[PDB]
């Protein structure tokens, strides 16, 4: 979901925003 | 299998850094 | 004022460590 | 809420559970 | 001993206590 | 081989967190 | 009071880094 | 005085995170 | 310079870019 | 591929620790 | 002992060795 | 250069000095 997605090839700043609150 | 519980510790550092003051929900239980 | 954005980085380490696989919502915007 | 509470005198393990998901 | 044991599948809270002082 | 010297850095974070005020002996030379 | 339980997390990083493979006893209960 | 040598450790985490692949020069000797 | 500036009130993303390479 | 952007975070901790007050240039774009 | 000594003005490399194992 | 060299087998203290400023 978020870990497997960012702990595989590093998520981009715009990708991390989707998880922001 | 340990990489998740370990790298996830750095993912949050960038998360609340990008969010700045905003909060974020971190759920490693994929 | 920097302590919050810095110590909060370690609070999450203990949070997902205590939660283990469970997730947790971290909102520093108190 | 959670930061000011744990970044002042360290929260206890049982206190951190309240924030668990 | 403790690293190879916890850096392979994560040790449990009760397992980490054995190393506590 | 680097994982040990790197992940071990997070193992201690949980160790003294679980121990709270108690201390702990960390010996990576297995 | 939180600085100890927080900065101590970085002291260990340098400790096992200077020790390399040797171990070290960390006791924050001064 | 310890805050600098400690918080600076997290400043770099955000630096190379914002830079992504680019590098960055970190000089704490202000 | 960069530490005293970001370790006092947190620098902004655009401020950290100035130090990027 | 994530190990670089993650372990590099600890390499800097040792770098400015060995350098003490001196600075250091960190460029992960090898 | 070791925390109050290194978390106040940073211990030197030779000072950290005393705590090595 | 420095990452691939230290993130593969850990660089030695004398090796890290070469990157010091």
From Swiss-Prot, chains B, C, F, G, H, J:
It comes from the Eukaryota. This is Insulin B chain. It comes from Homo sapiens. The gene is INS.
């Amino acid at each position: 979901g978020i870990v497997e997605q960012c702990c595989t090839s590093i998520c981009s700043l715009y990708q991390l925003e989707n998880y922001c609150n | 299998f340990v990489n998740q519980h370990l790298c996830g510790s750095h993912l949050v550092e960038a998360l609340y850094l990008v969010c700045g003051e905003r909060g974020f929900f971190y759920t490693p239980k994929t």
